[PDB]
């Protein structure tokens, strides 16, 4: 006879373990089990210590927060830290991106980021009278101000801008019916759009997704002077700590426990897990769209809510890290007008090559690596660039570097491109390499974007509890206002928990 | 009791109707039914007459053949024409692409195609010492010669090149394990690659697909001086005529008959179509990968051959046509050094804008439209460009223009870009517009490409009859040597038919 | 100093150019020069004087004199009456020749060197 539990939570990412923790506190007498199909808690948070670099943490998934905007993740870090020992405290460090000396290897030209404003004739993009001599940030924020006048006023919050975008029209059409790429193309040159792709480092951010959602999202990060923090001991400590709390409080976690499908019979969820049936009175799916899509053929209730599930598009992201006996990139700085050497050593170098983005990985205190065993985020790339790298394939953390080891041919092509980007013919050998392709099942993407014609403000409220008189719940980054962020996952966990507590 | 037939053929594209025609001739006493889920025969061949232009045919799908290379489609046109009346004959016309006066609007600069070889300083790409002053064709063919020495020798056929690629290695690795984009990146600059994307008109052709398959495929079209023919009365006449022949010969066609799934029980195929079960002793799926993927959840036999089905990737293609009261583009030609005017009027203009490719649509005799109601293939685009157009959405032929009508906002953005491309502030209003997005189910793509690490020469022979002692057959463009072509669909139909005739009993 | 290298194909022929009428002019006979230590590279003729246009082919990779010889030297660790193998070139010398040949011909990839031989005529007793 079948195992019977009160609350089944499927998905061991941050929203799943956060939800488990909250629900066990709210309902201490309920039998709550969280099921993860993979071999570890964390989902798209994957923190690994590089071999030979005990004071670094490579972030194959999520790596930083906007501490000034993202109140939920900042508050959760405090909620975790008030329970952890002094030894275990989560500590943040300042996370650099655009230092002026960093390289932009664009259309075969070696630029420094300061060339974008200081030497427009050198920038090999035919930018217009208004665009010329500006960063991608400046060009896109100004484009957004032309499209939604008043939106870039710095006195407004993300929430006030999201509201303005919900009521805004463009040539008589509601913003939620229009595409971000379509609208940007009305106000910037094709060359400004390509410059913004290339030098901004991302293909997926400027795609034709929902303009009403894209505009406030863009303004709060990639626009107005984004300020970031990283995690001394890895972002993944957040979900690992919440899992630990849930288990201390009498919750149960099952790893290697894939939900294969579920039926709703006799006012119960019948979950098929490892060819066994488990009965639960409530089911919470803490998982993105692709994870819901994979369950749909064996889960009749998901077949009833296709238009809700289909309201976002998964956006693959790819990261690969490489390590070296020395930070050889530091030799690709320059000599200033007073004869002082300016080292290349922190933040991001960009390129239109498939590498797209290279980070000089900081020490766990935020300081640059100036000597000894050092690390690149060799490539952080999206869009059509992922196919290039894919074709070359043949307290405590809970995953090792070795479990994500990169294949040799992929590493050799990375080494070739890093050399062309930095304009050197010799670099010390790669010692270690790891990678993650977040386009892979069950994730479908690193982030998920609202589709054109969707009203996010309706879908996000509906999909947390999508069928009336049915104890089915959904949470995570995918159907949030904070897409591409842990903040988004916590936002929808909070909306879902509020509904769950009102109903059950 | 369930309806019982001998041969079920599912898919009313070229390979399906060709297979139906051949099999009914071979087995006149068998009950052969062809099922098409859509409302018409043709699949990715969709020919429509524009309103106001009775002497034109817009090709929303396939539009031309390489008459010198593609012996199967040339022979099929003869096989069709030897049965058609003089009135109905299929007639071909010469189909232009690169005229030297045509525009390349690249990185904000207005070029003519002759600038690529005549004025390299004007071409806004930082091409290397060896690349500079050349077309994309020249750069990529030379890259391919560096990668597989001897392959571009003009004495070789596509078949001899495919063989060389099967035995070739690159740095000790078999070619079939390597990616086309990865290898091109070893021999051309990033700027030459982007120049080849932009000016060559296509994103999907230069993706990281199987190098062993991509190289000979590239050489036979986009490389060595590609020469093309169009169809006076539409490519779609080919599958329509074969359907007609099949029915005259006693074959049956059911339209609006979507196969929902099939089971194999008691040595029969049980086909679920419109909530009815039909029994068939042989089942032929004349349909691409995505169509097989959509059947897989309700078809246990397809679940057994996932690695075969998964051996290609669908490649979306998008086309939208616009019409005007006059061919306004002809005013965007130039005055030669002797004061003669050179009109812009035939072949293709290219851009890095989302339009990507614009064709000055020929009359049904191949001649340019020089006055009166005229047509563009306004945009023929692929890769990330399709998302841009998609987000703006809110003898006889057998489909109308109006069934594919384009929405206003899509048309207004096309008009904006056409104006920027041609460097004009005014054009006469669009009268009519039609489009097709071939990324949509059940097609998944306009073409399908062999994946890296696949041995095409094994999969193409295996997948036509993928389970031993099981009368399941597959044909079409998707698992062919001629991907992106009617030729490929006929190639695998012929491989499939040969296997079918060797294996199967001729009885009822 | 002379050093010869062989390849499965005459890859240099791909470093010609397209003339003003669209005809390809192959790089395939005589000498390419440089101020790099290679100094002189010959596209080695067949025994009838005709260029090698396909199959196993050979460069006089470097024919160099003066201070250039020290650069190559520091990388060291009918019938005819001597064999190629008796003058075999060491790997590190060959890898540096390959690097320079690539920079000279403006290519990032060439098929691997199959065989290499050299002679330094500054040596005793000459
Ligand atoms: C490359 C990358 C960079 C990012 N950068 C940042 C950043 O810097 N800062 C930031 O804040 N955010 C970032 N993010 C986003 C952040 O990582 C995510 O938004 C968040 O981690 C997702 O949490 P979630 O609760 O939605 O679920 P997920 O993390 O998606 O977890 C869902 C879980 O459900 C499981 N599952 C699915 N189906 C089943 C099933 N049938 N049975 C059992 N288990 C199942 C999966 O195995 C998975 O573990 C990044 C993401 C990626 C990929
Ligand atoms: C934009 C575009 C441009 C092209 N250009 C050219 C060119 O110039 N020249 C050229 O030679 N080729 C060209 N091609 C390719 C050519 O059109 C195709 O390769 C060829 O027509 C495909 O034939 P097929 O037999 O594989 O089937 P398809 O045409 O793919 O037809 C398959 C059929 O199966 C049906 N089907 C699928 N699932 C089911 C089901 N469950 N039940 C019932 N029916 C089902 C579909 O409705 C469809 O009609 C082009 C393609 C496109 C899209």
Author numbering:
A (entry chain C): 4 to 397, 430 to 539
B (entry chain A): 4 to 397, 430 to 543
C (entry chain A): 321 to 397, 430 to 478
Can I see the authors' text?
In this study, we designed a novel L-amino acid oxidase, HTAncLAAO2, by ancestral sequence reconstruction, exhibiting high thermostability and long-term stability. L-amino acid deaminase (LAADs)16,17,19–23 and L-amino acid oxidases (LAAOs)15,24–27 are key biocatalysts efficiently converting L-AAs to keto acids. An advantage of LAAOs is that the enzyme only requires O2 molecules to regenerate oxidized FAD. HTAncLAAO2 demonstrated substrate selectivity almost identical to, and higher activity than, the HTAncLAAO27; these properties make the enzyme suitable for synthesizing D-AAs from L- or rac-AAs.
The overall structure of HTAncLAAO2, determined at a 2.2 Å resolution, indicating that the enzyme has typical folding of amine oxidase superfamily, such as L-Lysine α-oxidase and LAAO from Pseudoalteromonas species, in spite that they shared low sequence identity to each other. The unique point of HTAncLAAO2 is that the enzyme displays a distinctive octameric state. We performed gel-filtration and negative-stained EM analyses to investigate the oligomeric state in physiological conditions. Gel-filtration chromatography analysis suggested that the HTAncLAAO2 eluted as 544 kDa (denoted by the red star in Fig. 1B), indicating that the formation of complexes in solution by eight HTAncLAAO2 molecules, each with a molecular weight of 63 kDa. The results show that HTAncLAAO2 has an octameric, ninja-star-like structure. The thermostability (red colored in Fig. 2C) and long-term stability (red colored in Fig. 2D) of HTAncLAAO2, measured using L-Met as a substrate, were similar to those of HTAncLAAO; a T1/2 of about 85 °C, and residual activity exceeding 95% following a 7-day incubation at 30 °C. We unexpectedly found a NOS bridge between residues K304 and C505 which are located remotely from the active site. In conclusion, the NOS bridge identified in HTAncLAAO2 had minimal influence on in vitro parameters such as enzyme activity and thermostability. Alternatively, we predicted L-Trp binding form of HTAncLAAO2 by superposing the L-Trp binding structure of AncLAAO-N4 based on FAD molecule. The HTAncLAAO2 structure suggested that the side chains of five hydrophobic residues (W220, Y383, W482, and W520 depicted in Fig. 4B, and L320 in Fig. S3) were located proximal to the indole group of L-Trp. Enzyme kinetic analysis suggested that Tte W220A mutation likely introduces a cavity in the active site, accommodating the long-chain L-AAs while compromising affinity for L-Phe, L-Leu, L-Met, and L-Ile.
